[PDB]
Design a protein around this ligand. Structure first.
Ligand SMILES: C[C@]12C=CC(=O)C=C1CC[C@@H]1[C@@H]2C(=O)C[C@@]2(C)[C@H]1CC[C@]2(O)/C(O)=C/O
Ligand SMILES: C[C@]12C=CC(=O)C=C1CC[C@@H]1[C@@H]2C(=O)C[C@@]2(C)[C@H]1CC[C@]2(O)/C(O)=C/O
Lengths: 257, 261
């Protein structure tokens, strides 16, 4: 009989962390035009357009994300829709850390926010909250490997209150990625667990931040006409789905602590 | 033919570490409390110290048969028992209090249960309240016996010399193995969120024993130093342990291990 196990294949297959490096999207440009006045209506509309371009890259990433194809298609779609703001805000803090040593908010290479832009955006305190995560990355000296695993954990951090089509398949993927993070921080058990706790505390802290970001997002979406804030098709699709679900209490956050 | 050296039957019948922890748990020890004598601090503290000595005899017997502990150098076995004794005895007190009184009292022994009045009379009221707070956490968390027995071993492995043990690697192997036992123990039939939340609560509880035990040891070293003025008596077993530990702890040689920063 032909062995159906392949030692060679299992040995040669890149680790999940190596695959995450391989599939990480290239940096996206905002197409920022310096000729427009730096008023909230213009800055926020630019950010929303940048978000639409980023989400095109998130979907491409999710398609090749190990384990994600094992979930029901409806669940894959659901998880992308519930986690979008967590994914994009965490990646903003990563780019800010890597490209500016967390001195600025690096939304795109052509759109870097200093304090002045943060004021002009009319969401200063929200920018401060995102900046505080970037500052935590410096304090923790977060690694790229840790960051990529934590991004997947954020994709798996909010589920519908009723539940997914396959709760079991979801739990299996979530447990597998938590295991990957636990391996990354490993001998000194004391030090490994202390770091693991710092990373899961940070993950949990994204829920309160994202809640505040979505509150402002839904507000500007509802008042888009009055406020002259534009949204691209991709965000209209996502927010039209999410706004009623989140505001009705259907979004259940998953915490480590 | 040749006699196979491995025993399939032995391997199958060998109990899990958790089952062994149940089998080796010490029997409850009596204090020999004498209600005919006044409940003065001298009498109550001297009774508790005598109780502690009897309890430590059981602890040593338990440590001899604790899975994995034999793999550590003898020097390290003795060191860990000496560094952790107050953690072990105080955690077990909270367990007895939880199991026998629903955490209403401090169940030092079947013949010595402290209510608030004895807590005041002992001249360590605040310390008694601190141990009682751990008992109350057991109720809030609905701690199980299995979780308790694994946590007690982690306390035995929670304080090490600043300079390190003879074999840090053998120590780390045993500590990791028992942390894995606790992790499996809190794994539900699966909900990762619930499992991690409980693991967090249990490790926060473990860590909280350090500040409590530091305060307990401060009082202990104080009454030991002033034993004659205070008329507090210590049995030979505690004189041995405290004489070793007092200079080591006060000189800053005891390194507590934490799960959380
Ligand atoms: C996704 C985004 C754009 C790209 C990025 O790297 C990080 C973020 C996170 C913060 C988002 C932002 C937006 O695009 C516009 C937002 C969504 C904002 C929070 C409030 C907001 O300013 C809003 O709702 C304007 O209408
Ligand atoms: C070990 C012990 C005795 C048996 C027990 O179930 C739990 C404890 C924990 C608290 C201990 C105690 C003692 O025996 C006496 C102590 C050690 C006390 C804390 C201060 C103390 O009261 C003291 O130093 C008197 O001299």
């Amino acid at each position: 009989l032909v062995p159906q196990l392949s030692t060679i294949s299992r040995a040669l297959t890149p680790s999940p962390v190596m695959v995450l490096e391989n599939i990480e999207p290239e940096i996206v440009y905002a197409g920022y035009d310096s000729s427009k006045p730096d008023t909230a209506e213009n800055l926020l509309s630019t950010l929303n357009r940048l978000a639409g371009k980023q989400m095109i890259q998130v979907v491409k990433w999710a398609k090749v994300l190990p384990g994600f194809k094992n979930l029901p298609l409806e669940d894959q779609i659901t998880l992308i829709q519930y986690s979008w703001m967590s994914l994009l805000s965490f990646a903003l803090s990563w780019r800010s850390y890597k490209h500016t040593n967390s001195q600025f908010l690096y939304f795109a290479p052509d759109l870097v926010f200093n304090e002045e832009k943060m004021h002009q955006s009319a969401m200063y305190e929200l920018c401060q909250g995102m900046h505080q995560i970037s500052l935590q990355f410096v304090r923790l000296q977060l690694t790229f490997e840790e960051y990529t695993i934590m991004k997947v954990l954020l994709l798996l951090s909010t589920i519908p209150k009723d539940g997914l089509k396959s709760q079991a398949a979801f739990e299996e993927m979530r447990t597998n990625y938590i295991k990957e993070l636990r391996k990354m921080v490993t001998n000194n058990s004391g030090q490994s667990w202390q770091r693991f706790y710092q990373l899961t505390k940070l993950l949990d802290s994204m829920h309160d931040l994202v809640s505040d970001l979505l509150e402002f997002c839904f507000y500007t979406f509802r008042e888009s006409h009055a406020l002259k804030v534009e949204f691209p098709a991709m965000l209209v699709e996502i927010i039209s789905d999410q706004l009623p679900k989140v505001e009705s209490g259907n979004a259940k956050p998953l915490y480590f602590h």
